[PDB]
Amino acid sequence: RPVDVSVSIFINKIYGVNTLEQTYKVDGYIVAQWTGKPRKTPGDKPLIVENTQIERWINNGLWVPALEFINVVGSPDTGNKRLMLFPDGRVIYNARFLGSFSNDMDFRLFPFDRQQFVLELEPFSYNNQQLRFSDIQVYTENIDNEEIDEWWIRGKASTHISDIRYDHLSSVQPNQNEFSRITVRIDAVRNPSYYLWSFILPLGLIIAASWSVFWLESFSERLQTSFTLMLTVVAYAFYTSNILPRLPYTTVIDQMIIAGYGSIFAAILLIIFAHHRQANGVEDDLLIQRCRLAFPLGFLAIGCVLVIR
Amino acid sequence: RPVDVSVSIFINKIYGVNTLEQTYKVDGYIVAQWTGKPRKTPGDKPLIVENTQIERWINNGLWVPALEFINVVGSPDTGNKRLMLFPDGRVIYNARFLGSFSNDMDFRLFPFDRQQFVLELEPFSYNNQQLRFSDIQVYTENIDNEEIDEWWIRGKASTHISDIRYDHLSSVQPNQNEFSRITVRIDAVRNPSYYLWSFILPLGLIIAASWSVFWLESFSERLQTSFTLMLTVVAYAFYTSNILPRLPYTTVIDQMIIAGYGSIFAAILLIIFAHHRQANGVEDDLLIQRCRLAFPLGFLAIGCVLVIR
Amino acid sequence: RPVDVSVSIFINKIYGVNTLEQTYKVDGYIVAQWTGKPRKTPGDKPLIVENTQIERWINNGLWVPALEFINVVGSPDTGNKRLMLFPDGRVIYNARFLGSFSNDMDFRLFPFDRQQFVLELEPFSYNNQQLRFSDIQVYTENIDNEEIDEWWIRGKASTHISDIRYDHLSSVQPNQNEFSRITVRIDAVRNPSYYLWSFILPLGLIIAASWSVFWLESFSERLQTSFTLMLTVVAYAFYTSNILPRLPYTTVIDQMIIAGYGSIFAAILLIIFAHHRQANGVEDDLLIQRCRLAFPLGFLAIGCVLVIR
Amino acid sequence: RPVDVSVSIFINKIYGVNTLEQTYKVDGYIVAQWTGKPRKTPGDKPLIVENTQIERWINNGLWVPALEFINVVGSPDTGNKRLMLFPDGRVIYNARFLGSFSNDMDFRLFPFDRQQFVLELEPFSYNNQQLRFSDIQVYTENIDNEEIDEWWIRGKASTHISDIRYDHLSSVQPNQNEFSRITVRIDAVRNPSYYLWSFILPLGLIIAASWSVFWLESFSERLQTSFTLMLTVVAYAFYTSNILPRLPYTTVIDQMIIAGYGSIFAAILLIIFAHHRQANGVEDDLLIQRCRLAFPLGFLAIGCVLVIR
Amino acid sequence: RPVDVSVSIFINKIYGVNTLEQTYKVDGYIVAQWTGKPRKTPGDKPLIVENTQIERWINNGLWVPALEFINVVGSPDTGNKRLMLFPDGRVIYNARFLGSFSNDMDFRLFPFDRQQFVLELEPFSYNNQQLRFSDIQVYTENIDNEEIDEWWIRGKASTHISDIRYDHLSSVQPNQNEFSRITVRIDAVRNPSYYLWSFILPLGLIIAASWSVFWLESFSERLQTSFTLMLTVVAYAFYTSNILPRLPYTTVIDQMIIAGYGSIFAAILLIIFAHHRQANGVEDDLLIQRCRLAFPLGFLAIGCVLVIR
Ligand SMILES: FC(F)O[C@H](Cl)C(F)(F)F
Ligand SMILES: FC(F)O[C@H](Cl)C(F)(F)F
């Protein structure tokens, strides 16, 4: 009884990832084929009907079922539409689309995160007793200059036809609560280049150079210098937060920034301590100088357990 | 007399809060059912009508009442529409929507505020003598990976059907000025982590280290250094406000920053005072040094009394 | 001869003021009533025509005059539309709207400016010999928690029906060049809190704290420090300008900042003068110390005459 | 033989300059009048046709010619449309429009530049053998409050009917390649206020105070203080560039900033030389102190040749 | 057998480059001519059909094939449309368009990069056995004032009609799988003005002036100062990243900045090394002093081998 419909999805561009909304944009084509009652066509050649003329065939009673992108956000932008009506009954729908799609996206390991861009397709009104997906093919371009793209695609796309039970239905009962759903999956990793060299590396240089406060020889010099070091980190928090993507949680880099604040406050506490540690009011220069390698090691050790994943 | 309408709202995503506009975005489905004139459908099976075709049926005289989201801002983005016409009279309207919705939103306890996401639904043209809401069912996903979600939902959705009296109507009088309204409410509280670690904590470290001005030995060091501390708070206000949400009032973090300006201004007023209080021109080291715990307590005491709620 | 139209405007939300564009957003309903040729309606009860069906009634010749928002900017977004057709001839038009509206807006007294949001309504094609507004009622919500709102509405809306002479018409002559116009005005003053506590006060503190340069004891100390203060004001100007609204003129806050630049430049000029005013190259400590209360009065005096209004 | 069309353009608001795109936004009405086949109208009075009805008349063979805004960028937002059909043949088209329009715009003299806003109107399909503009009238409001406006309109609009030869036409030969084009011109100058007081003045003051490096007596004091000044110019470059419009070339303020970097770098090169010029290792106090008025002249003279215009 | 289509493309504006999306905006006209069955026109003169009337011609069966912009991003904004119907069979389609177009864009040599603005045009439904492009003409305006443009167009458009094999088809087999494609290319280079004078040059001045650290005579003076130089580079990093285009990779300016960080961290290491290299604490004034020209050469060399091309 149910109509077998064959879907092919062509993907042109995956771009414009929004971290805060957890969406991404996909431009592509959708093709759908099914077979119905045969037809008289002009010539024994297939009939092509475009755009606004498709609507006319729907009014004369042509069955063209609505297929919904389950995870699109807002009505997709539809370009050219096409129906190909064959005399032997079969019907092919072809359309270009650009839409914004939603998926769960975890950005905590930024900039070393992996994301998967998902498309989910399901007929809007017809259950699997009426319309079912027979098979699904997905085509992706071979990116050859992937080194200049924001995202690197990792392996060809995954497909999976399945059936979805809607419990809470305002319809009827017997086996009429399941729908045929295509799910396309594409794995991807973030191009970590820019952030290593322009963010991680100079943040490192800055935090290390902070440790050299202990190679200053006065107390006055060490305390006062660290206030400049403090200012530098605040400025660095500002540089990063303004350019990196906004998120509701802390990233790896955000954690480094917080660490930098800590190492400088810690140093302020030791610098101020060695000035009073011992009797005589003598500067326990045993404590400093040990600090010239206590911090570059201490921070780097208890900071070497950032296995938070 | 009145037609009973049964509503189901499936909610897919609540995202995009706009602090200054006091709005939020909701992706979902709305279903509405009523019973009308019984009907002849092809086969004794229900008839499905999609998209542009609902309109044709509206014209041959099918009643599909406009149900308005009373607190939406702008015409919502409607995806696919579906009418399901039953032979025994029933009609089910099904449509997808993306909309920006409005509610009073108090963000004064940011980042520790709680908000409720509200939907208000009301027929546009017909009163409760003509159309009444029989019941409202709201379906929401249960988010468990709420830790990468900005908001924690505090229970399944609460509802309230009621009747609204419009004083100023230009229509008629006897009992025809009341409208049936569905109101959906979803409570949620904000996940404060990010703001705790990346905004509250380092502001604390900065404000704390501010106090270490009193451990400087000359007056010169004490006064000149506090100007750098002042610069540091300004640099921090810039960092926060460039990234934190815009509001017409002060939040907690806004006040901590103001406190920082104050603690540094007080310190300058004291640093300069302890230098000229006594005869002999001798540095009143009595006033200083006591400040080394006067401030870290005074602020921490006069700051543990911000019971403004 | 002319048709009487009765208008009601319900205002839901006034938000999104754009300072450079001098526009603001308004969500609301517009109701318009007039009486025409009596009609047979199904049952002697009024007939409801919604949305796309209004169009069909216009094509068969129902007179529904377009009312134009004179000061809207861009075609407004119309929500649900309704015609209610009475058997005794009268016709009521109901539509939801969201639009961007223009008005002269002076932001020179920011953040203590007063604005009035105006709506101006006028028929697009019919002159007062053809269509005139009989009366205008405006209803506004009573916001009770206005302390969480950016703008405080100050009083109920004022209204005014009047007549407009268009001189340059390519039309006809006898009394045919005047149009009936509704004008709505809603007064408002800005919520000054956030800007006082988070912008004005710390700028005041910082400007004052700058005066403490004269209490440093070296010439070297006094001059070198002024450069740090100069930087603090540049940074503060940046902070305010990045957050406050864009304007083609200076506000009070813009002016305080200029004064900050000035008081610091003045001090540099004196500090550098006191080092060479007198013979011996001796630091003229007579001039200094006297400045320690001269500026906090001097700036505080010639700055207390910014009655530029 | 060709149809004479009389055009009137009313201009309501000119706003929203986009400097990088070289566009501006224009709100107004366009009126267009011509004469055709006389007509039977209901009553011997003129017939009014609004909005959606204009299309219906076009299907019965009414000629309503497309008049295109040639320098518009993307289809304008057309508000209400109106046709006024007179019984004696004449036809008037009246429409409200908001559009983004393009013109060559030179921002090199910012914030003291003068610009002219242009509208170019031309029929889309009919050449001057078929349709020609008889005349063009342009009306603008008389602005009295220009001090609160970003732009000062300087004089009434000038108008210009002419003809355009499109050489490469795929049509025929004799004279069917010329089209009549209206060109409206409105001159305007920028309100320089905000940029004078909040950008030019303090940059000068900063640059002035930068010269006061030479009144410090040690070399150490002079060199170290030079790094703070350098930072202040970087801070200032950031402040302006965040607020000023983006351009692909430098402005006066951009130049002042580059000049500021130079005067600071220049002083650094001398300060470092005077410490090592002569034998004895003597801080050549002959060179400095003489610089206390050499630079404020040297810069201010070699700065008197930024006559790039 | 197949129909010949003649295309002419007029290009008005190429603006609004989006670096992250790798797209650009194009305003223009598209003209397409082909010949069909001769026709009765009113008079033996060509027939003009504008805008909404084209659809009526389509329903009665006029063949107007959809030509798709293959590398557009989203459905283009189409202005006025026109059909010119000649009696001797030929047909002309004329339309104005605004669209965002996609191409591979390498921004690594910023601000000295060259780009190609590409349009790829292809029929949506008909293969080359049915419809083919005979010839293609591209017309572009001649810019004389390029000194005020963001982009410099470098040479006229190059053209190339070609044929594309689509592998994955659900149709038939013999020779039905190739399509006719127009590809337009326009080369352009960026106006480097603003970036040389207001970005590159002061970076040089700033990076160079960092080298003047080695001319300080104290160790204290040298180390404490290098922390101020550090602050200056982060602040400059902020200035650049806020105004330069966002990209996923490093530019030459980005690399200088990193180099800027390096030269200062190196400097901190030598300054701190020269203080403890030798016995007794004798300050190795040979290492310093040699550095007074060691860095200005080393950096200027290891940054002069950023010939990565
Ligand atoms: F604060 C400034 F005035 O001086 C420089 Cl930046 C610092 F920070 F090192 F002290
Ligand atoms: F310098 C920057 F890194 O930070 C801001 Cl600009 C300053 F200067 F105020 F500290």
Numbering used by the authors:
A (entry chain E), B (entry chain D), C (entry chain C), D (entry chain B), E (entry chain A): 10 to 318
What does the paper behind this entry write?
In this study, we co-crystalized ELIC with the general anesthetic isoflurane, which is known to inhibit mammalian neuronal and muscle nAChRs3132 and GLIC33. The crystal structures of ELIC-isoflurane were determined with resolutions of 3.0 Å and 3.4 Å in the absence and presence of agonists, corresponding to the presumed resting and desensitized states of ELIC, respectively. As a homolog to eukaryotic pLGICs, ELIC shares similar pharmacological profiles of eukaryotic cation-conducting pLGICs with respect to modulation by general anesthetics. Thus, isoflurane inhibition via a direct pore-binding mechanism is likely accomplished jointly by stabilizing the closed channel conformation and blocking the open channel.
